[PDB]
Amino acid sequence: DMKKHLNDTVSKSFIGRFFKLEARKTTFTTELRAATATFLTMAYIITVNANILADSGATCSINDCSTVASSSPPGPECVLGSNPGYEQCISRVKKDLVVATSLSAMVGSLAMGLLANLPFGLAPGMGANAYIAYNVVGFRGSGSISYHTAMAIVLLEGCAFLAVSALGLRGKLARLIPQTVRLACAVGIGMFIAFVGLQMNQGIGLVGPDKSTLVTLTACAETDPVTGACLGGKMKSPTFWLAVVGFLITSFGLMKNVKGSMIYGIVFVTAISWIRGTQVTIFPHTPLGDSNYNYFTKIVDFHKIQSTLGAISFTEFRKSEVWVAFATLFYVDLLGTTGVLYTMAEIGGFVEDGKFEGEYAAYLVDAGSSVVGSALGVTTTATFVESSAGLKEGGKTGLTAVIVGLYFLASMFFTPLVTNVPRWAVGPSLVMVGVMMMGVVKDIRWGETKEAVTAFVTILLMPLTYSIANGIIAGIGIYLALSMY
Amino acid sequence: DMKKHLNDTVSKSFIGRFFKLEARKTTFTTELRAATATFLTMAYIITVNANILADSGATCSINDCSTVASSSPPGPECVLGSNPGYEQCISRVKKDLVVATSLSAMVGSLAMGLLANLPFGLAPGMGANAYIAYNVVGFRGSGSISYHTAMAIVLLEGCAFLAVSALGLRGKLARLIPQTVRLACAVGIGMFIAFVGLQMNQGIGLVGPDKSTLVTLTACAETDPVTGACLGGKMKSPTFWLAVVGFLITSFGLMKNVKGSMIYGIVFVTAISWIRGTQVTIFPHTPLGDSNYNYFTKIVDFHKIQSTLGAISFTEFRKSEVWVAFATLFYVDLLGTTGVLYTMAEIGGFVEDGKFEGEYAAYLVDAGSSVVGSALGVTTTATFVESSAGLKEGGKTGLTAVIVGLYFLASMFFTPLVTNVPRWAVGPSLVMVGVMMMGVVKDIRWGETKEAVTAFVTILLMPLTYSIANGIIAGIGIYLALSMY
């Protein structure tokens, strides 16, 4: 009877009256269990998002390169790599981005818990970060838009979404969109994300260049340090097989319904790779590896934001090729939010005939916690679909988001253990999230050619052309041209 | 009453008794209408397959190159292009391949009509030719296997299939395969075929190379003649827009259910491109264009096979990297035939409780008419899924295949009109067939992760790695590893 008296003294306290613990039958233990389940399922993003945004040309630029035998280092030599100053800068930025993402997940999860009494969790999810980490800012200073404007457009989009959802218009704005294009985009983004975690610059290394044909299987061991082409060997890379083993371990966690799956595989691969000396190690004997090991000697640390702190440059909104990014970010956010939260509501005992009793505040918290992320060094956030563990277990009030935020407190003190995760351990998680996103393709009306052609074009043009915007543009254009009357 | 007496004098003739026109209620007019419908739907392959196999490094080799200022032309300079002798050789081979494909479609359609009394049509379909035109023989002499062995493996596979289906084993052989892998392969082959008709060497030219990322949108006009890289311009290619217009015309033929769709778009684009003088023309003012126009001056011709006549080299079955191609061709044929014909049977009034009354001969005719194709210059054939027009209209006997063969007689006399079809008019047909193949993805069990992971891996690894065999191997390996007990 030890649990019963704790539950009832909590319920009769002011917390219980504030959250109405008596109504919507549930106890403190069930809510805590739901919160820990959701955290275990969704904890994979503290490192995945940080690693995605770290190799995305952050504040570090050509001005922070080291000194070489030449007079001054020009552009395309430092951003490529093989330079100590830029590597140290990127290591510091990757160290900072973990704390930035944890703070961005806490601010917004606490808001969703307090302002609205709903059991959800918020953090900067896939999509928008996968969009403006390789398509807008490019890979290490590529593309046309610098990193400063990439946060400015996120701030503008968040403010625009807040304005649009405050006074009621977004309900009538996201309903006129065709039904097939929404699902086609949702599938194409997942396919593109899965494709990203395969190349031999951000993933395991299963795909590379070729002269005659564009893409060829090159999981190859002799790997040129400067660029990444191989001088022999095929499907004998010591790291690719370990990554595949980790992916198999993760995949054999989805069946039999284990609590959290991706995090276990990530930590298994990382723990195996932490061994100093083997050919699969993450700390080599170079001075960079020595510094990384010296920092890893201590397991807990209190890092302070010093590099990518709030710093927004509003001096680039005078040209083209930037407003299109804003338009497509608005489109993607509107596509996601309009469906994910309403679908998530049905699992719980919340959906009513024509209202939700908390929709208005939940939609404003989701958009509201985007300015805080833009002036932090991260991208837009969204209600997580992979929070169904809590709704399946229990808990109908704001003891899920608050406890998730309290757990995320105990996630930024372990920065040394989250900064040395190898790049090849991320790939399996990206592939798994691509599979989960693609799982919805069975809801598309493939019968009539009008929807089938549009869906196929939108799905295909995203991974091949390596740009999310082209798929949406080509889907909308085909749908408009076919329906000309 | 003019039609009635023709119908009854045909029925009471020996043809009617031989085909049992009285039973399986139907008349001569209905069967002829069904045959013309099937021919109009499926006539798109006389030129598509010829164009696919023409730029696949045919008998033409380094020994047929012209004379230049150097002593002798080495390998990688002639097969690339920009040489008169090789261009003339490839033009002659493309001229011959149309007649070869027409003969291969006739022999086998007549057999399916006479030996078995079923209304189907046979021709070398997509898949196997898309496989051994860019993956085995490669693009113009690439890869590891010469063109001579590519026909030898087809002959061996056809003989093996005939032996396997003669004495009953293939019924119990194609049933132990997992259900998800079959559909995953069927979708991946379609995706790969659609991807093929996009590159700027065999398709419209929407996809090309890039340094940082592997694939980038490059529908670009300034196009280097030697290789195909552009020195400026984007999405302003005068031929890409015409190809897109043709694709739209074809797509606005699938709704409203017009008889044949792809052929109309192909002939529209080709007729527009036949104009001499414009920047989109197919006959330029170079001597090659002058010779092509001189041959096009006459509209009808009786071409005789002179280059790729039966010529099989059985001297390469001593090494590796060839038996794997045989195994995967056997796998693909077994995957296709086991489902397409049984599904096609249900539409007609033929399927019974446990038999088909004609399955045994139909399965042997399909495999039997592969040796004749191998010793002709083409690839394996299969019963066409896009013959549903006849079964929907009428006709329950062998007046469909015989009339289809008679029509294919009136398709090789028009070689000049089938040899000058531009390369950019083929792409829309490839994309449309990719859409039709992908349409089946809704039948895959995406619920459980065991099937979803396998299906996603098999679907994704085909277009990215640019090889059909890798997708099948990676699907089978994952399915075997996940189910280890």
Ligand SMILES: C/C(=C\CNc1ncnc2[nH]cnc12)CO
């Ligand atoms: C809505 C956006 C991205 C969509 N991503 C996600 N949307 C919903 N749940 C998730 N879990 C992980 N990532 C996501 C960006 O605004």
Ligand SMILES: C/C(=C\CNc1ncnc2[nH]cnc12)CO
């Ligand atoms: C079975 C094979 C290829 C599958 N291709 C096709 N299978 C069935 N119908 C068709 N129509 C056009 N192409 C096809 C090769 O043996």
